[PDB]
């Protein structure tokens, strides 16, 4: 998670960067305790079940937009950012995180490296991504690869300057897509210390049962995870 949030420079909103996060354990308790995000909105997921729920895959979408344009990142809400650059599904089960970064993404002479899609031919279908810099034909005259009237470049640069106001400051936005289709994405789950000489209920790598958990002086092969007896009942398990 740190590499996405604490990255040096993000990709622009039109070409937002999609990172597949899988085969790891989530620690969302840090994000709530972070208290460094200007926007912290979770629509389809509530914090009570968020930290202890399993999903097939989670993707890290991150980009940089302006303060006034943070609010368009919402299911149902549309506009110049939510229609041509990145549209959330109206059934957005996930979270929206944004924070101010006028310190990094603002140059004195003008940070013109973060761009958007201002004017796109149509609206976008779900899971559609317009990275085409195709010159717009805003009339009848075909654009022969050259700029001019009715021939405009579909990408315009943000006027990121430190002197700009709150709404024009660069607000770094990270969206973690929650979806479920195999559960390689989980949360902390709290690894509770074990007990000895007591039959209790345990969760060993997704295995549950009742029986006394005592010391054992057997050496089993490292690759094998757990064993069974003649009657196929589990008799031992390896703690990570």
């Amino acid at each position: 998670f740190d590499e996405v949030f604490n990255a040096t420079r993000f990709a622009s909103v039109y070409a937002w960067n999609r990172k597949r996060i899988s085969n790891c354990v989530a620690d969302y308790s840090v994000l709530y305790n972070l208290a460094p995000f200007f926007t912290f909105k979770c629509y389809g997921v509530s914090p009570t079940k968020l930290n202890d729920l399993c999903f097939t895959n989670v993707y890290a979408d991150s980009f940089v937009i302006r303060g006034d344009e943070v609010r368009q990142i919402a299911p149902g809400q549309t506009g110049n950012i939510a229609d041509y650059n990145y549209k959330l599904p109206d059934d957005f089960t996930g979270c929206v995180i944004a924070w101010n970064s006028n310190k990094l993404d603002s140059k004195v002479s003008g940070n013109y490296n973060y761009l958007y899609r201002l004017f796109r031919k149509s609206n976008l279908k779900p899971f559609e991504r317009d990275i085409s810099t195709e010159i717009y034909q805003a009339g009848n005259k075909p654009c022969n690869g050259v700029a001019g009237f009715n021939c405009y470049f579909p990408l315009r640069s943000y006027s990121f300057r430190p002197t700009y106001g709150v709404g024009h400051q660069p607000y770094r936005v990270v969206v973690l897509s929650f979806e479920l289709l195999p559960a390689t994405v989980c949360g902390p789950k709290k690894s509770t210390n074990l007990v000895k000489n007591k039959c209790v209920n345990f969760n060993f790598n997704g295995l549950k049962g009742t029986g006394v958990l005592t010391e054992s002086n057997k050496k089993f092969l490292p690759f094998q995870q757990f064993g069974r007896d003649i009657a196929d009942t589990t008799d031992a398990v390896r703690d990570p």
Partner: antibody
Framework: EVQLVESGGGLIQPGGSLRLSCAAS????????MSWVRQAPGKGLEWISL???????YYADSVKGRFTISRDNSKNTLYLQMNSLRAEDTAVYYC????????????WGQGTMVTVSS | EIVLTQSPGTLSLSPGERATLSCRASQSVSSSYLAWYQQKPGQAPRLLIYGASSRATGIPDRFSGSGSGTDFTLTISRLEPEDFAIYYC???????????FGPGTKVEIK
């Protein structure tokens, strides 16, 4: 030349229905952001609705739910389905072009009269 | 809601004099999302300035906008007889599409 020509106004009883129709010449409305702005007699401009080139339509709460905006690609003419009329809806209704790049309106139409009286 | 407040409501000045209008927003506007208009009696509003600094096409250079945050101001270097009419300022919010207009200013021949 680029100009808009509003039509479809007139006298309407309260609770009646109308459909304003302003055509565009020299500009393709389907590719642009487009809004309706009215002017109550002796009052300031009140924004009615905006339709995105992406198709999303938003309204002010004073007119939300009663009206419906639409667009015909075959004729380059705007629509604003007028319904459930009350007395203070009487205003001169302008449809005018939104420049994009957020917050500017340059090309206005001449204006058409809408009167809501018994 | 970001309410636009214009000042003054009436500004009586002679031709050739400098007119100054102030349109103050109830909240800090995001780097001048302001549109400026000319409206004459019986005529539709005519845009002059977008971004509170950039003049539109066909707008005399005597008009010049200025402002940031909450305060935004027009300066008319020379008042001409065709310029005397009712004037409205306009802003845009994003989460609602707030096209809030100012109360207005009537500039009269003095």
């Amino acid at each position: 030349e680029v100009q808009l020509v509003e039509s479809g106004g007139g006298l309407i009883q309260p609770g009646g229905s109308l459909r304003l129709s302003c055509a565009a010449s020299g500009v393709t409305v389907s590719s642009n952001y487009m809004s309706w702005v009215r002017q109550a007699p002796g009052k300031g401009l009140e924004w009615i609705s905006l339709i995105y080139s992406g198709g999303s339509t938003y309204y002010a709460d004073s007119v939300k739910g009663r009206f419906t905006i639409s667009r015909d690609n075959s004729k380059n003419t705007l629509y604003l389905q007028m319904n459930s009329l009350r007395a203070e809806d009487t205003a001169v209704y302008y449809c005018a072009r939104e420049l994009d790049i957020v917050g500017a309106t340059d090309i206005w139409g001449q204006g058409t009269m809408v009167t809501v009286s018994s | 809601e970001i309410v636009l407040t214009q000042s003054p409501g009436t500004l009586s000045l002679s031709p050739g004099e400098r007119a100054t209008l102030s349109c103050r927003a109830s909240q800090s506007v995001s780097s001048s999302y302001l549109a400026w208009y000319q409206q004459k009696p019986g005529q539709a509003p005519r845009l002059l300035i977008y971004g509170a600094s950039s003049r539109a096409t066909g707008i005399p250079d005597r008009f010049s906008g200025s402002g940031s945050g909450t305060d935004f101001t027009l300066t008319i270097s020379r008042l001409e007889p065709e310029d005397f009419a009712i004037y409205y300022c306009q802003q845009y919010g994003v989460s609602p599409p707030e096209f809030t207009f100012g109360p207005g200013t009537k500039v009269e021949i003095k």
